[PDB]
Structure 1
Amino acid sequence: GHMLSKRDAILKAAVEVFGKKGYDRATTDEIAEKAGVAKGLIFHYFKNKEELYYQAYMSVTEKLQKEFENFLMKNRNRDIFDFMERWIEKKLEYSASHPEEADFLITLVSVDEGLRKRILLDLEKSQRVFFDFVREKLKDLDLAEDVTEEIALKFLMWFFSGFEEVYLRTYQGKPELLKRDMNTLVEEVKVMLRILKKGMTK
């Protein structure tokens, strides 16, 4: 019976403690105890706590990216609002089923600005897949002749990404509550995208 590589064990423990305590409050002593490794092995694979946080972050966002690209490739031809609605439903389900990953991702706010910036630069190339897709699909739309593709794209991304942020924070450490509110959230999201569509297009 094979176990996790020592690297993946550290990363899973990292995802857990960081998510619980936050970056600043978490200790690599604790992450190592939790991983069932000697304090010094964190140093071998990672060098320092900042680098641990960073690889942990890339490792989780890499998982998410694969999910997304599969979804993209299957639902590419959909109407852009239908696309987003469906995608949000899917992220809602991931989050309730992967609460430790969820709690961890939302910790990106509380890290020193230089660490956070590094992550967003190294992440820009992947987040631009969804961004370029929407920008593309917006061309197939009848935009209200006071609304720029720029404003539409801006509004749409901000709805999409702030919604993520709002529920992750509201339901941090409370997965069963998210699950209880799932159906309502999905229906609220539906109407909201229908408001954007209507207000946004001719």
Structure 2
Amino acid sequence: EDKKQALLEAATQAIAQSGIAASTAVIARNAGVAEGTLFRYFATKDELINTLYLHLKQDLCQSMIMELDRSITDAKMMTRFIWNSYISWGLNHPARHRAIRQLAVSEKLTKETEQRADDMFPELRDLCHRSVLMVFMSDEYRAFGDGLFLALAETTMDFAARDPARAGEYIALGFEAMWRALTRE
């Protein structure tokens, strides 16, 4: 539904600007529909959080797969592509990125929502289990591992954005920082 879609887009800008606490009424006005129209698509605010996130994460992963040169047979060079695509996505889509960050840090994501976010780039689990330190694949510390990678990717992005001039150098500098910190001997 272009109407569903409109709602997802309005939800993106509203959440980007105000957080998950963004009024379900304000979302509806910006989408041109009535608060009830929305309730028929997203039963609860939590189910919205979860559907947005999947839709944003989908988008994020389409960019990555598309930019991924499947002829790259080197793990580090492969990780470079993911790192590069992840950063470009955020730079070219500030709202989608702000929004997806809130959702992911909202504490309202179902485990169901998690497993659906993986099936969108399964061969990507393949990279980690090759390069990443055993402890960061650990059931106890993988969340932590991904976190470090993410905070590292976010700062690189802040810099690249605030100082366009040098982005390429930040992006490179940030990758090597993350490789030495997260990756195997």
Q: Aligned AA for 1:164?
A: L
Q: Aligned match of 1:80 in 53, 75, 83?
A: 75
Query: Which runs of 4 or more aligned residues in structure 1 lie more than 4 Å from their structure 2 counterparts after TM superposition?
Result: 151-161, 169-172
Structure 1 position 124, deviation (Å) = 3.5
Q: Which runs of 5 or more residues in structure 1 are unaligned?
A: 139-147
Partner of 1:27: 23
Give the structure with higher Rg (CA).
1
Structure having greater relative contact order (Cα 8 Å, sep ≥ 6): 1
> 2:142 & 2:36 partners in 1: Cα distance?
46
Give the conservation status (yes or no) of the 8 Å contact 2:152–2:178. Answer: no
Q: Which residues in structure 2 correspond to 1:19-98 (within 5 Å)?
A: 19-23=16-20, 25-72=21-68, 74-98=69-93
| Structure 2: gaps of 5 or more residues | none
Counterpart for residue 105 of structure 1: 100
% same residue: 18
Cα 1:109/1:27, change in 2 over 3 Å: same
**SS of equivalent residue, structure 2 residue 67:** helix
- Structure 1 letter corresponding to 2:63: E
Q: Does 1:12 align with 2:6?
A: no
Q: Is the 8 A contact 2:50 2:103 kept in 1?
A: no
Offset, 1:156: 9.9
Once the two structures are overlaid, the 10-residue window that deviates more, 183-192 or 44-53, is 183-192
Distance change (3 Å), C-alpha of 1:151 and 1:26: same
Measured against aligned partners, the alpha-carbon deviations of 1:60-99 in whole angstroms (never above 9, x if no partner) come to 1112222233334x23533111111232122211111100
Secondary structure of residue in 1 paired with 2:87: helix
The alignment's C-alpha RMSD in Å is 3.5
- Summarize the Cα distance change of 1:59–1:34 in structure 2 as closer, same or farther, 3 Å threshold: same
